[PDB]
Write an enzyme that holds these catalytic residues in place. Sequence first.
Site, short mmCIF file in Angstrom:
data_model
loop_
_atom_site.label_atom_id
_atom_site.label_comp_id
_atom_site.label_asym_id
_atom_site.label_seq_id
_atom_site.Cartn_x
_atom_site.Cartn_y
_atom_site.Cartn_z
N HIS A 1 -1.52 -60.61 25.68
CA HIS A 1 -0.56 -59.89 24.83
C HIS A 1 0.33 -59.01 25.69
CE1 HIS A 1 -0.03 -58.01 20.63
NE2 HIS A 1 1.07 -57.72 21.35
N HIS B 1 4.15 -57.73 26.76
CA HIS B 1 5.60 -57.62 26.54
C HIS B 1 6.24 -57.51 27.93
CE1 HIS B 1 5.43 -56.90 22.13
NE2 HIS B 1 4.15 -56.67 22.49
N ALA C 1 9.58 -54.82 20.81
CA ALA C 1 8.71 -54.97 19.61
C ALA C 1 7.77 -56.17 19.72
CB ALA C 1 9.55 -55.11 18.37
N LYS D 1 4.81 -66.92 19.42
CA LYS D 1 4.43 -65.69 18.76
C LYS D 1 5.10 -65.59 17.40
CE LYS D 1 3.05 -61.28 18.14
NZ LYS D 1 3.50 -60.31 19.13
N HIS E 1 5.72 -62.87 14.61
CA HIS E 1 5.76 -61.40 14.51
C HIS E 1 6.46 -60.99 13.22
CE1 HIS E 1 6.19 -57.21 15.50
NE2 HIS E 1 5.48 -57.42 16.62
N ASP F 1 8.31 -58.54 12.71
CA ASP F 1 9.69 -58.04 12.89
C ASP F 1 10.71 -59.17 12.90
OD1 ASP F 1 8.37 -55.60 13.17
OD2 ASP F 1 9.15 -55.20 15.17
N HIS G 1 1.08 -61.66 14.65
CA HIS G 1 1.18 -60.27 14.17
C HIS G 1 1.70 -60.42 12.74
CE1 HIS G 1 3.01 -55.93 14.69
NE2 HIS G 1 3.18 -56.33 13.41
N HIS H 1 -4.20 -57.97 17.99
CA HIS H 1 -4.59 -56.61 17.52
C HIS H 1 -5.20 -56.71 16.12
CE1 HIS H 1 -0.61 -57.01 15.81
NE2 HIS H 1 -0.03 -56.82 17.02
N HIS I 1 8.87 -46.02 15.12
CA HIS I 1 9.53 -46.61 13.92
C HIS I 1 10.61 -45.68 13.38
CE1 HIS I 1 6.79 -50.20 12.91
NE2 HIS I 1 6.51 -49.80 14.18
N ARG J 1 -1.61 -47.81 7.86
CA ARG J 1 -1.68 -48.63 9.09
C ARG J 1 -2.68 -48.07 10.11
NH1 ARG J 1 3.15 -51.61 12.64
NH2 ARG J 1 2.10 -51.35 14.66
N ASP K 1 -1.15 -55.34 24.96
CA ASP K 1 0.08 -54.97 24.22
C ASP K 1 0.97 -54.15 25.16
OD1 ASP K 1 1.79 -55.11 22.05
OD2 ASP K 1 0.28 -54.46 20.58
N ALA L 1 4.52 -52.12 24.54
CA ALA L 1 4.95 -52.18 23.11
C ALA L 1 4.04 -51.29 22.30
CB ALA L 1 4.92 -53.57 22.55
C1 LIG Z 1 10.38 -45.73 21.89
C2 LIG Z 1 10.53 -47.08 22.21
C3 LIG Z 1 9.59 -48.01 21.75
O1 LIG Z 1 9.69 -49.34 22.06
C4 LIG Z 1 8.51 -47.58 20.99
C5 LIG Z 1 8.37 -46.23 20.67
C6 LIG Z 1 9.30 -45.30 21.12
O2 LIG Z 1 9.13 -43.98 20.78
NI NI Z 2 2.01 -56.76 17.35
NI NI Z 3 2.78 -56.60 20.91
O LIG Z 4 2.05 -55.75 19.18
#
Ligand SMILES: *c1cc(O)ccc1O
Ligand code: NI
Ligand code: NI
Ligand SMILES: [O-]
Lengths: 570, 570, 100, 100, 100, 122
Positions: free
Chosen positions: A137, A139, A170, A220, A222, A224, A249, A275, A323, A339, A363, A366
């Site tokens: 996992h 990024h 993300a 993947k 996800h 998002d 995810h 996760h 977020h 969550r 992770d 991310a």
């Molecule tokens: C900023 C950037 C991210 O990718 C995640 C969280 C913050 O605060």
């Molecule tokens: Ni995820």
């Molecule tokens: Ni991730």
């Molecule tokens: O993730």
Amino acid sequence: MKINRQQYAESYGPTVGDQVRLADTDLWIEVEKDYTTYGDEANFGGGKVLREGMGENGTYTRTENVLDLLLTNALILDYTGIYKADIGVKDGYIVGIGKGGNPDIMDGVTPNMIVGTATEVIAAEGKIVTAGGIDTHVHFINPDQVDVALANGITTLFGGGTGPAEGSKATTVTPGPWNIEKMLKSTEGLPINVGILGKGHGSSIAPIMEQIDAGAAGLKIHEDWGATPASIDRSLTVADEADVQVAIHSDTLNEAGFLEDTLRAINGRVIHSFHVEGAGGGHAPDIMAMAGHPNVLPSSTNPTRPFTVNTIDEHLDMLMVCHHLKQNIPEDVAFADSRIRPETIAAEDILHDLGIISMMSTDALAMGRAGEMVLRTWQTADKMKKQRGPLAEEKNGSDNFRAKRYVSKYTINPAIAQGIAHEVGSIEEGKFADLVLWEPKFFGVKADRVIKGGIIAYAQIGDPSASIPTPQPVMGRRMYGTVGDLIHDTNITFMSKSSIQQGVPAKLGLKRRIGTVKNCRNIGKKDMKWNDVTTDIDINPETYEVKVDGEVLTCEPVKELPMAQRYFLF
Amino acid sequence: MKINRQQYAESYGPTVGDQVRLADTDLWIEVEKDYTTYGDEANFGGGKVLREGMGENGTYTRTENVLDLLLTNALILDYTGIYKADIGVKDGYIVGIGKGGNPDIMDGVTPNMIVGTATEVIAAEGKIVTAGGIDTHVHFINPDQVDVALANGITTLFGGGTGPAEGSKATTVTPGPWNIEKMLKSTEGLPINVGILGKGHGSSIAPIMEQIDAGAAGLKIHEDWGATPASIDRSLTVADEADVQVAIHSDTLNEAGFLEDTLRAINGRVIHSFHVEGAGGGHAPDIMAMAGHPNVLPSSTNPTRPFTVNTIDEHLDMLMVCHHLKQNIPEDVAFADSRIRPETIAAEDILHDLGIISMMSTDALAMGRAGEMVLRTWQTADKMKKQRGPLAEEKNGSDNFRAKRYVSKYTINPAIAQGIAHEVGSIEEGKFADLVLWEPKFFGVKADRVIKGGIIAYAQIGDPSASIPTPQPVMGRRMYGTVGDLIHDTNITFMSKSSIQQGVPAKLGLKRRIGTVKNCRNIGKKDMKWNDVTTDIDINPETYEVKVDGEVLTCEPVKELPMAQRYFLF
Amino acid sequence: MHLNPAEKEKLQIFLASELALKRKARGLKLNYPEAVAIITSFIMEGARDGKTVAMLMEEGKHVLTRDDVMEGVPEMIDDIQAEATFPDGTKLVTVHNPIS
Amino acid sequence: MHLNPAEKEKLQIFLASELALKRKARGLKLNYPEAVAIITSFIMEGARDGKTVAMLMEEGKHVLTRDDVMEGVPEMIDDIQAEATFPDGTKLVTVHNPIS
Amino acid sequence: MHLNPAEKEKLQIFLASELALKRKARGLKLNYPEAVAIITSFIMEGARDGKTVAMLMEEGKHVLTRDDVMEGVPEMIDDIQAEATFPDGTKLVTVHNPIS
Amino acid sequence: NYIVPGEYRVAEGEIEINAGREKTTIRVSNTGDRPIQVGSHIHFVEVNKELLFDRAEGIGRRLNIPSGTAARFEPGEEMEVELTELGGNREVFGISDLTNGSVDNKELILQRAKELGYKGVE
Ligand SMILES: *c1cc(O)ccc1O
Ligand code: NI
Ligand code: NI
Ligand SMILES: [O-]
Ligand SMILES: *c1cc(O)ccc1O
Ligand SMILES: *c1cc(O)ccc1O
Ligand SMILES: *c1cc(O)ccc1O
Ligand code: NI
Ligand code: NI
Ligand SMILES: [O-]
């Protein structure tokens, strides 16, 4: 002539029945068996055994059963056992585990483990040797992440991203043929093994499949990008045709479905649930129920590992800021509270101990720490020993059963999930020589030497201007395996069968070893080494209470961990 | 019109009869001759000589006797002389030493040293220019060692190793065809010239010879692999067939023989005796007697150079810790006392001064300092001038004879020993343009600019964000010669004739310049420039007293050295 | 300044030693890298002061005691090695079992 | 912090200056890189204080004297140059013969 | 010492914080990178002291005030984030609007 | 309960080296004026010519000492050592070139030793 056991262990490392503490934990591993012949141990230096006509054979050419490298007197910690052996490497692969030396004069020499003119020596006496960690996992956000991973004994990064773009920040996604090609070229410069995931999103097969043909090693899904029934279904149809793995995810928001809808879309097909506890993402609040199913390969990410007194405060705030959530918007607070759940984080510790969650992962950058997958695995095993006691399966007062269950989570199980365990993930004959040497006092904290494809890639070593290599400052440094063209021969780019058949490596000019992803679609939970438990996990929708076999799984957070402030400067 | 000599030297650097202090030593070098025509000196800048139609020729194309680079007004310090000249470079080689400029208008222009449209200019007025140092005892342990070497004016590393493996940490050995191939690929990324030594151990020819055919440039015989009569004999048989050099670290333990047995195995064949004083290794206590023989090319390693009040305390402890020796085990203390000897270390200073030890080297990261070969050569010459006086051969109150004897030890003599002096090791027409510019105040301490193959590779230069290059912080930095593909054209990989004939460079995809090792087997002590003395060296087995021509060689250690605390931040 | 690679790296040791000394001053038991940094910087500053290798081998055993460091740290540090420029050039100091 | 490459490099000068000032405080005659570090850091801190280029050209000649440094160090340092952010942006300061 | 990449990088924050604290001590209003360095180093030293994430979220809002920093700096800093090793391992601290 | 990170807890008992192989004790004298140190795995008949002992008793043998250790002989020192049998194929190649094959060829080993002046061929 007899040697006292304390002196034996100081000279050659431990032997059968001897125990070794893992770092500053309460965990003890015991030597189960030893391949040596007492009195014919291999060792290297002035007046030592591995000299011409003695423990080094002076007759045989390299092709004639001679090694390129012998790791002498290793204490192997692996899913296959905890035992003492010499490790022989040739053409960048592990060719022999047993007893190295010279059959001219020594008893018990493994026939293809001859020390000859062609042989380099690494002394592993008093070291623990493990497989390189397999992080599934990742990024790809900041190239500085690679040294962070090597320093904690990780040798393979599977994931996605194009650098610090919002999609990559993300999601473990390198989207589309062009971004995949660009990141395969980037990979030529990264001193670690790599596999790239494409975007597991679409309602037509062709835009998903063209990523696999371009050189992706998996997909993947996800939330998002829309973790919808359609995206899930098309990705698994591609994966079943292409023989690659799909990571998910899921839809935290339950927008198009609840967990049972995601499982209906999966329809019994194999999938890697990222996760799986759900702080890192997934159907609120019950995603962790995925880990009970036979077609699910479940991993944790690392910041929930293990449950500590700072975990919830740190996670609630991390989720709100990342977020852009506002503490005075009730829907934002309700979302965060749905969550980040102490009930599921505490139960996650126990599900690891029971072999119901099969894998760890980072992770990285991310929602997870590139250099703490190995670290936090052992902190979890240590916390479970303190709170639950030795597992019933233990003997001799050792923690061998727990140590095999936990080392499997970051070595062999991710490799099996991803379709790459023919190449990496364990110390076995015929696998790539990705090996990590640990001083026991630093086990799981700071690797001593990281071997990639049979050459040291990364080491904790001192002043380059000094008379000897140990003077200060001792720090993690890239070694000759990372320099010039040797970076190509010491590392693997894992790719789909179809991209390999279509000649993508030659099209892009890739010089790295090319690894084939395969055998990912007819596995399941039963194929996870020491972590093969299927069961009905119930998550109470009102209280977030986790039950397994009608038993509530609860656990306390700890105020202190081993492998923490004794070791780190910050 | 006449110029006062002080003003002349400030504008153009020194001329005939002028003397220059080497750093903060007592050593003075005197300009022996000057190639210039007074009034037609070359110089570059606003309103200066090297301008179109003036000192720069505007007519000739590059092929027509025009230079790619002119170093103006250099004070050359070389085995061939100490003198003032312009240095012309073309196609990465030194093509002219003499007087550069424009024959249209200037008297005395060397015919192939035209400054034209194609010509770059480096101002060497007020600098000392030497050949790049040739370090023939390098352990390849930590890639950070390369910048350490460049910063002290080293441009060629000959030795062995695969990184921080125990075989490499002890021995200058890259063992066998596969490790050699891997390190030749690694070399593609190292911004320095390189030659790799294989393991000089075996009782059959084929396992030794296959290393030479794989691309090794020579062999190392080391006691830690068995410095036996058989390994010595087979290695020299290979070397005589292959035309490469053999280096030896002999049997300190006298296990299979005493020095006379090692010399019988050598049987009059050429050999390079590493760390010939013996603190770094060799027959206890008399190895240094090797330096009297006509078939021996003797080098020192650097931590014994020169003999100081901290030398013995530092060496005894270094040997005990690196060999895991115990202060309460009498055999360990006896061994250490037999190896670390003030009698042989003191005599080593004098044997350098007398031209009986021909070469210096580092022993980088095994028992020696990557960045102190040049430094310690001059500290030794300085200590000998203080204790023994000017040599009888000196004139005019200069130290020219000593300066030529000592500069030869780290430039031309290692290059001759290794079979590479057709390419490197001196400032002569037809040799590769590896040149080091020194400010006299930093001579032998910190190089100003290191030129590799006619392009600056390394420089002491300042803030990259500044308006000009000199603002702080001034530190050693890799220059454009190290970047991208230019690293291939500025550096040489030295290889055996057989590996070159067999197409190893094309097989491995090597893009570096390929240098041929040759003419190493019919040389001897007589071929060492300014350091060609053969004599009977007697080492008393009871007292460790060294005699040459019935004279005891004794010397005192010093409490302070030049080129030390005035310069270094640590 | 003309810093070479070792001079740049060794500035880090001094900085880590300054950090560790501030942590000790506010009453913390020191950890493994803090303890190593303090003893290493002590050795390099001793060389700069013109002490002998033998003086620093002795003194390095008295810079930190067991009650300055966390449990286990004394047993983690078998030795500390440092090179620095003495009045007679670079030398290696090894301090054996610096914390009893 | 958003450090650019120059800001990262110039932290090293401040650190070397702190090291050198501690060596001077315990009575050592300073060497060439110590002397350069102290004068350089003085210039950059002066710019941060809002002094003019002309003030720093004058002051830089009075930071260290001959009796603060080892034999030969005054004659080794012909000038010291530093760039720093003044209130009116980056400027170059050159201090000529800083130690008489 | 066995420094990993993060430990080497984070030494820089402590160094920048020491620089900024010296500038504040001689009466300067701090700029954006100075302010960030001071608050960041405070967080990492707090973790080393064994404070909780919640204590540091509160304390980080009181390290510097508006009258410690130049015009606009409070509004430039929306938050400061740092990871450090607490007694219970690495944790992330986020300080919201640290300077009011 | 004091924690030493990475510490061993070794089992009870002792390790017997070279178990089941014939042991032989012999007297050996360093007749030379420089020290000689002999490693655990050198074919004993092939050591330094100036060590005086019954060379026949070194054939097919090495020192019965822990792997990687060595016996030291100061100049003029005579002492007893214990030998064990070589194992594996019981062949030796190289070293001093006395054997280059089976250790069973005692006659040929001792003829080469005597011609080259290895002391103690009887
Ligand atoms: C900023 C950037 C991210 O990718 C995640 C969280 C913050 O605060
Ligand atoms: Ni995820
Ligand atoms: Ni991730
Ligand atoms: O993730
Ligand atoms: C956690 C888990 C258990 O099984 C028991 C106790 C704690 O705290
Ligand atoms: C450690 C490592 C070496 O290679 C040598 C010496 C010590 O102490
Ligand atoms: C050293 C060498 C000499 O020849 C004379 C005196 C010393 O100390
Ligand atoms: Ni040697
Ligand atoms: Ni060496
Ligand atoms: O050596």
